[PDB]
Amino acid sequence: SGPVPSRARVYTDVNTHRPREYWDYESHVVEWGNQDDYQLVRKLGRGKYSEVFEAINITNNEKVVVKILKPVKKKKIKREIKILENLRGGPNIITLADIVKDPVSRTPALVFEHVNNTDFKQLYQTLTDYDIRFYMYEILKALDYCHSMGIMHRDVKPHNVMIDHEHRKLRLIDWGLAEFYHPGQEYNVRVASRYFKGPELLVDYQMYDYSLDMWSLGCMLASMIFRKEPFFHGHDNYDQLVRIAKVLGTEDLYDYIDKYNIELDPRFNDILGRHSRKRWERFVHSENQHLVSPEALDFLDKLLRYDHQSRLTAREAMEHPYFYTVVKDQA
Ligand SMILES: O=C(O)c1ccc2c(c1)nc(Nc1cccc(Cl)c1)c1ccncc12
């Protein structure tokens, strides 16, 4: 009978109501600067499809970041650029400063705003209960903004959240997997990073939406409040669902599969087994208790749901009691 269709509960038709130039990124004309305006200082890291460098803009001595793209479809480069241009100036969204090309190799590169980041592997262990609430609220500002702008990030994870802790400044980076939400579209499920993949990706339910990012956020929150990084530690995409099922239980998983008429891959039948929904208190211990509260657990419970439609939206999440003290302090 095929899967049951799904629509986002919020910002459903935002792209339909915009001119085609907004979302038809393949038609976007890119104007490439000369990479000679930037002098590379050092390599910061290598990605799946990019090499990132710290650089200096020789014209004004500003420190920037240059993301040299490895060859990918021109379609995909135009998508990242168009999304970054559409989101530019939005709350906690990384700023695309320039688009250049090396004169010799012709390799395209994206120039970004520099953030003085403290890596999550060093930062998260130092965060107070207030800090987690504060930064979660900052991520929510970025997500509600991009979702309102008709964009799903599709790769929310600690590496993609650059935090200048000294200045309490946060930027959501790496828009390379981001996509425009169009109601009825069947998207690629080979997105996000394993540990942050929502159950919709794991069961191959393609008609997903912005709510995908809310699952990923919930994975981040659970790792922060429980000091268990990553929270769901699967060995592969199949075992990832098993790890989730051992916490959220199998009853709701099978109800989700039923509701959407999802044809489940036959290997899941043997590996999923039967598991009760675990109480969040089972993850609380002497070393993380100070980060856990009834508000944190209620909020986490409302993000970590199989049914993507039942998760809090970024706007609903911002209104949660977990953030009452942050919201008070920001006024
Ligand atoms: O991709 C983007 O959108 C993107 C955008 C901005 C930054 C970035 C990636 N990666 C950075 N650093 C980084 C750190 C570790 C490994 C790698 Cl590969 C990169 C970085 C640092 C400071 N300011 C901005 C950025």
Curated annotation (Swiss-Prot):
A single BP term in Gene Ontology: regulation of chromosome separation
Compartments where found: Nucleus
GO CC terms: cytosol; nucleoplasm; nucleus; plasma membrane; PML body; protein kinase CK2 complex; Sin3-type complex
Signal peptide annotation: none
Top-rank taxon: Eukaryota
Keyword Nucleotide-binding applies: yes
Amino-acid positions noted as binding ATP in the UniProt annotation, renumbered to this chain: L44, G45, R46, G47, K48, Y49, S50, E51, V52, K67
Region (Interaction with beta subunit): 35-40
Quaternary state and interactors: Heterotetramer composed of two catalytic subunits (alpha chain and/or alpha' chain) and two regulatory subunits (beta chains). The tetramer can exist as a combination of 2 alpha/2 beta, 2 alpha'/2 beta or 1 alpha/1 alpha'/2 beta subunits. Also part of a CK2-SPT16-SSRP1 complex composed of SSRP1, SUPT16H, CSNK2A1, CSNK2A2 and CSNK2B, which forms following UV irradiation. Interacts with RNPS1. Interacts with SNAI1. Interacts with PML (isoform PML-12). Interacts with CCAR2. Interacts with HIRIP3.
Official protein name in the record: Casein kinase II subunit alpha
Protein's organism: Homo sapiens
Portion of the parent chain present: 2 to 332 of 391
